[PDB]
């Protein structure tokens, strides 16, 4: 459950948030596979309720109406085509599994759903599954509102409705089996694992009961006896009732402390300095590396009021974002997930974005195709951060140094830091308001290395900055604080 099941040597997954299956299929072939990405976290592939007030928000996909593979991202055959095509070029698919609940209690009964299935939320009826009222926790929840009132009572956090989301009776074998049937259909198709949505809202043991029913991965792509990769979404920033450690027996857990702390550090807020990252990881009170799924931002908190609030860095703060993602991709702690987003018109009111509901780029509700420009950027409002040279090459960096230990740390007691990964990679950052000018021990074999942040190695040449590592491993680094990207990275495969 903890092994990513990505091909050996591939160390990151990318969240292609709201992307269509036909677009992801092609993206695997034209980019993700060749660029060494481990896999793609796709948006919920199961049918959801259509929300019109507001108009087709991204969050309508977290309100299931059935387990049919039919959404704005595409149909079941397109989903299959995507999983097959991606696995064939070595890129896995990880499904965002929304299994804690069905849709909102107030959704109207009818066929206002992504595949036309009928449902009657008012009376908890989902005939397309099928589920009935007795398949929900209404009779188990003791709160007057029927929702979670105290997030300190483990019972209501798990048994009541997460803000009106109809809460499935996960203790019932019928429910457990219906969910497992869905997950197994996906595993058999070729999916490598799952993001378990709203894990905090399910009992660790009910999740275990569902996971235990799952098939081994498809042997057309995985060795026999391979278990699906599981990463559970649990937000725990410390000092709260429910701890992420309660879920370690099921698989990895999202470490939300990661981006919150890194964002605060890179923004140089509240006295934090990059030099304090020397003991990044468990030293900062984070969960064990082998249980962590890390990321700088996720689809929810990149909107500003999620775990970490305004400290979270996103594509909107590109320069700083690249430094945070670069540090994450270079550091050995956790399994890394990179975000890929779409743009929207923000509307801040006293610091809060009220347009955070806006869904993916669309034409009258139909999601727009991801167009690729000659310079590798994307059109139609897709940001495609995963295609930014600075991120793309750091994803490769992580692959190259995979398995190598944290080494050769250096810092200027302020915001200039550097470190390496065994004898295979080295990275230097300047997040101070003045020039970085130092000769540092890289731990790398002597020679000329192409800096992969400013350029690439092509044949026997570099397109950007070159770093000369002397025979004893030391090299001179000069980074202006006015540099577009104030960091340099070199590795065993960027050496000339």
């Amino acid at each position, epitope marked *: 459950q903890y092994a990513p099941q990505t091909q050996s040597g591939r160390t990151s997954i990318v969240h292609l948030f709201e992307w269509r299956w036909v677009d992801i299929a092609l993206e695997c072939e034209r980019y993700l596979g060749p660029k060494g990405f481990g896999g793609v976290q796709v948006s919920p592939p199961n049918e959801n309720i259509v*929300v*019109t*007030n*507001p108009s087709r*928000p991204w*969050w309508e996909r977290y*309100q299931p109406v059935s387990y049919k593979l039919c959404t704005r991202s595409g149909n079941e055959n397109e989903f299959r085509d995507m999983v097959t095509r991606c696995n064939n070029v070595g890129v896995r698919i990880y499904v965002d599994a929304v299994i804690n609940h069905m*849709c*909102g*209690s*107030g*959704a*109207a009964a009818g066929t206002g759903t992504t595949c036309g299935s009928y449902c009657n939320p008012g009376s908890r009826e989902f005939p397309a599954v099928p589920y009935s009222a007795w398949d929900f926790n209404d009779g188990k929840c003791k709160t*007057a*509102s*029927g*929702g*979670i*009132e*105290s*997030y300190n009572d483990p019972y209501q956090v798990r048994d009541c*409705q*997460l*803000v*009106g*989301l109809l809460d499935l009776a996960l203790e019932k074998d019928y429910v457990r089996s219906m969910i497992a049937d869905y997950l197994n259909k996906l595993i058999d198709i070729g999916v490598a694992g799952f993001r378990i949505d709203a894990s905090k809202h399910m009992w660790p043991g009910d999740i275990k009961a569902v996971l235990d029913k799952l098939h081994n991965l498809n042997t057309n792509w995985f060795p026999a006896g391979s278990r699906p990769f599981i990463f559970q979404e649990v937000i725990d920033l410390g000092g709260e009732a429910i701890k992420s450690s309660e879920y370690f027996g099921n698989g990895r857990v999202t470490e939300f402390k990661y981006g919150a702390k890194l964002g605060t550090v890179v923004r140089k807020w509240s006295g934090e300095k990059m030099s304090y990252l020397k003991n990044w990881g468990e030293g900062w009170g984070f969960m064990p590396s082998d249980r962590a799924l890390v990321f700088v931002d996720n689809h929810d908190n990149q909107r500003g*009021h999620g775990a970490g609030g305004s400290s979270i860095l996103t594509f909107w703060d590109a320069r700083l974002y690249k430094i945070a993602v670069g540090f994450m991709l270079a550091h050995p702690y956790g399994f890394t997930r990179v975000m890929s987003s779409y743009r929207w018109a923000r*509307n801040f*009111v*006293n*610091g*809060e974005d*009220v*347009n*955070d*509901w806006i869904g993916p780029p669309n034409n009258n509700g139909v999601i727009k195709e991801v167009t690729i420009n000659a310079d590798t950027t994307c059109g139609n409002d897709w940001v495609c951060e995963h295609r930014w040279r600075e991120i793309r090459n750091m994803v490769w960096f992580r692959n190259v140094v995979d398995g190598q230990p944290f080494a050769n740390w250096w810092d200027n007691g302020s915001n200039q830091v550097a470190f390496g990964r065994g004898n295979r990679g080295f990275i230097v950052f300047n997040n101070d308001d003045w020039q970085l000018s130092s000769t540092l021990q890289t731990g790398l074999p002597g020679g000329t290395y192409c800096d992969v942040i400013s350029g690439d190695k092509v044949g026997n040449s570099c397109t950007g900055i070159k770093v000369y590592v002397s025979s004893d491993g030391t090299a001179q680094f000069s980074i202006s604080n006015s540099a577009e990207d104030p960091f340099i990275a070199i590795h065993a495969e960027s050496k000339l």
Partner: nanobody
Framework: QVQLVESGGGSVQAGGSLSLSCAAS?????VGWFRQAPGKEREGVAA????????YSADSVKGRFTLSQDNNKNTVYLQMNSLKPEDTGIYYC????????????????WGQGTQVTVSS
């Protein structure tokens, strides 16, 4: 960029009813009603999470007050039944984005309020 228009309220006899309305210029996840009674601090009355229709009501008015949202517009309605003198006060609509409705936190914009006075 957000404006709120509060309607309803006014004078009514004890045991009577009133229906308040809060029309927002844009969508927000949480909308709550608060009131400030004569010489007392502001108090949460009811709140609704707009992604689902889920509502939370203060013990002081549950069963008597019902908050709902329009199916098409960015407007919420507070049906106030069985009113009593203790309900007199200025009622304010507020927009927020908290998922912890019982905490009354996360509000970022407040309306001008509407007077509610319960006689007898």
């Amino acid at each position: 960029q957000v404006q709120l228009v509060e309607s309803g309220g006014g004078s009514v006899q004890a045991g009577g009813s009133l229906s308040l309305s809060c029309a927002a210029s844009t969508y927000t996840d949480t909308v709550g009603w608060f009131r400030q009674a004569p010489g007392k601090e502001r108090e949460g009355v009811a709140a609704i999470y707009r992604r689902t229709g889920y509502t939370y009501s203060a013990d002081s008015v549950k069963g008597r007050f019902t908050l709902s949202q329009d199916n098409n517009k960015n407007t919420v309605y507070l049906q106030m039944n069985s009113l009593k003198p203790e309900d007199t006060g200025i009622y304010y609509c507020a927009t927020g984005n908290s998922v912890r409705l019982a905490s009354w936190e996360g509000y970022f914009y407040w309306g001008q309020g509407t007077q509610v006075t319960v006689s007898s």
